[PDB]
Amino acid sequence: QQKYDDEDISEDIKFLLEKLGESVQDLSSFDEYSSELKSGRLEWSPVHKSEKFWRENAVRLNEKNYELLKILTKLLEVSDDPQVLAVAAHDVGEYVRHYPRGKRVIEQLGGKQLVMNHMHHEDQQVRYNALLAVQKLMVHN
Amino acid sequence: TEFWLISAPGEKTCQQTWEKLHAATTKNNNLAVSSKFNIPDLKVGTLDVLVGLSDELAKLDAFVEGVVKKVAQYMADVLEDSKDKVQENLLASGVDLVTYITRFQWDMAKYPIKQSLKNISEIIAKGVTQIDNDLKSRASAYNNLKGNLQNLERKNAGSLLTRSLAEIVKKDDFVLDSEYLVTLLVVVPKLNHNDWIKQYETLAEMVVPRSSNVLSEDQDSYLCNVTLFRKAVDDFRHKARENKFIVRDFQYNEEEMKADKEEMTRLSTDKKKQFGPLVRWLKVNFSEAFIAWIHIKALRVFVESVLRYGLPVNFQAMLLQPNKKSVKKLREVLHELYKHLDSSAASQQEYYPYVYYKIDC
Amino acid sequence: ALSDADVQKQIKHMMAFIEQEANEKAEEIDAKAEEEFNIEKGRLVQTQRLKIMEYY
Amino acid sequence: RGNVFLRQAEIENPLEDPVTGDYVHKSVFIIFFQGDQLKNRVKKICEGFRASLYPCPETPQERKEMASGVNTRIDDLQMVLNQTEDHRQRVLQAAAKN
Structure with missing residues (x-):
């Protein structure tokens, strides 16, 4: 945004924008992300918020009979750490935004009531992310 | 040349007299011309579809009236022996038009009624198209x-x-x-x-x-x-x-x-x-189209009567050539004689307790 | 502009007309029956005629 | 030719109207025809002038049973709304303090 008469500084800035952008694109993936899902410790890999992740490869989250959604449902039922719950609930919301049949499937899972019960977790942030998931399910409901 | 065509449910046999002249249900104290209508018997088949059939029948009747008025307009514009001002008293099949509605005959030879009314109307529509292209x-x-x-x-x-x-x-x-x-x-x-x-x-x-x-x-x-x-x-x-x-x-x-x-x-x-x-050709075409126009009008009248009266095929219908301006008094009197058909309530608009259509020049 | 009785009258009229439509559809089904049977009778008769003629 | 049965009821203690917000008492006057084109024309005039024709009533009471399940779901939705209005009041206070 600022302008400099030294082409060295501007050139280094542009080079960094470029390389760091390539790295950001490298972070975009679904196999590494799903291994991170399976590991049981949901690190905040930046793909959780990527719009390209929720449009170009949202259908990837529907693995064999919604395999990975079921894995995340199990890890939601078992673990109640704030950040795993946040990651899984947010990712489920971003997926179920685009798939109404995915919404009905998630309702069939029973995980909707599991989130409705996560609404009473001791930390209010967890209650709020469950709230956000519910208002992602409220559409036409 | 105003003509009021009215029909009623017809729950009593003696109302045939009402169709002709009968004093107790006469029009304007036996001063307005009242005649019994030639009522034919036809087959309905279905009541569901007949809604759409009657709708298209009304639109087609409007079209055929358009045909008749156009052919009459050109006959008037012949500028010799026929005009809207002189010689307007033409002949429907050798006898005058008013004399023909008062002599309203009816047949099934040229249109076997055993066929559905849809096919009959389509046949008359084909004849209408033919005469229109002929005139044009x-x-x-x-x-x-x-x-x-x-x-x-x-x-x-x-x-x-x-x-x-x-x-x-x-x-x-x-x-x-x-x-x-x-x-x-x-x-x-x-x-x-x-x-x-x-x-x-x-x-x-x-x-x-x-x-x-x-x-x-x-x-x-x-x-x-x-x-x-x-x-x-x-x-x-x-x-x-x-x-x-x-x-x-x-x-x-x-x-x-x-x-x-x-x-x-x-x-x-x-x-x-x-x-x-x-x-x-113009004379025969006009007589044919005119008789066919009144024919389809009779068909539409019978149709709407069957819709508005019920399952049996018995009703009353009767022509009017009303007396000058007395048709308003008649509106009130026939209101008296037809409100009890519904027995409960009855703006009226075209929602009358009777089935009505108009015939004119 | 109809009472309970008159509404029932016309409802029974729709019912009787449903019965008339039942007569009509039954007539159509009978017509299909008669013609279809004549068709199958002729078809089977002719086919078996061909077979017996061949063998003979 | 209105000639079908009337199912009528009076609803009092109304709620705010969908399209005007009016807290106005209602009353249903129900006459149904099995004609299909007649049903279409009736739907046209009823929607155009004034009507609310969402449901599909039918003989199976299973529809009513699923509707009871819907009314429990509906209860859950109101408690959702209650939480959210509490939260928005509190966050508005928090922002207003500074």
Whole structure:
């Protein structure tokens, strides 16, 4: 945004924008992300918020009979750490935004009531992310 | 020619008298013309579809009325023996139109009622299309003859400058086998006729002396011609257009002049021979379309009656040719005699307790 | 503009007309029956005629 | 030819109207025809002038049973709304303090 008469500084800035952008694109993936899902410790890999992740490869989250959604449902039922719950609930919301049949499937899972019960977790942030998931399910409901 | 067609559910046999004249249910104390209607019996088949069938029947009836009014309009525009002002009392099949609705007959030979009313209406629609194309084609032919005749008339009308010169200028009025001499038909008004007869030779270079001849005249000017040199025609025009003179370049021949009068006369004669059968066709077409129009109206009336009255096929219907302005009193009286049909309530609008349609000119 | 009784009257009229439509559809089904049977009778007769003629 | 049975009821203690917000008492006057084109025309005039024709009533009471399940779902939705209005009041206070 600022302008400099030294082409060295501007050139280094542009080079960094470029390389760091390539790295950001490298972070975009679904196999590494799903291994991170399976590991049981949901690190905040930046793909959780990527719009390209929720449009170009949202259908990837529907693995064999919604395999990975079921894995995340199990890890939601078992673990109640704030950040795993946040990651899984947010990712489920971003997926179920685009798939109404995915919404009905998630309702069939029973995980909707599991989130409705996560609404009473001791930390209010967890209650709020469950709230956000519910208002992602409220559409036409 | 107003006619009110009214029907009722008809729960009592003796109401046939009400259809004809009966005093206790008469119209305007036996002063309004009341007649019993020819009610035919037809097959309904289905009540569900009949909603759409009646809707399309109404639209088609509007179309057929359009056809009848168009054909009547052209018959009036025949401008001979038939007009909206004179001879408006035409004949439906040899008897007058009002006499035919008062004599309203009905048949199934030409339209077997055992067939569904949809097919009957489509058949009459096909006949309607045929008669429409017939009228349009024959009227296009009549309009061709008429336009050409009238344009020929207007071509013939005028003065020598602006009219055909078949009968006026002849071969004796033109130089024969001229080597270098053109005889211009220099029409010159009376305002400048003597100027021309005393300047004819000096009006162009190399003009034949004493070639001052006079041929004919007209309402605006006196035709005359002078003989001069071929290249001197342009000089003559230059020196003569400003003198109020004018040149009438015309070529004379025997059949070149007679053929146009022959064509106009033949056009009139064959146009005559063809308005004959044309008007016979117009009469039969109008009678056919008129009877078919009232026929489909009777079909629509029976349809709507069956919708509004119930399962059995018994009802009443009856013509009216109402008395002058008494139809309002009749509106109130028939309101009294038909409100109890519904027995409960009855703006009315076209939502009457009776099934009504109108017939007119 | 109808009472309870008159509403029942026309409802029974729709019912009787449903019965008339039942008669009509039954007539159509009977017509299909008659023609279809004549068709199958002729078809089987002719086919078996061909077979027996061949063997004979 | 209105000739079908009337199912009528009066609803009092209304709620705010969908399209005007009016807290106006209601009353249903129900007449149904089995004609299909008639049903279409009735739907046209009823929707155009005034009507609310969402449901599909039918003989199976299983529809009513699933509707009871829907009414329990509906209860859960109102407690969702209650939480959210509490939260928005509190966050608005928090922002207003500074």
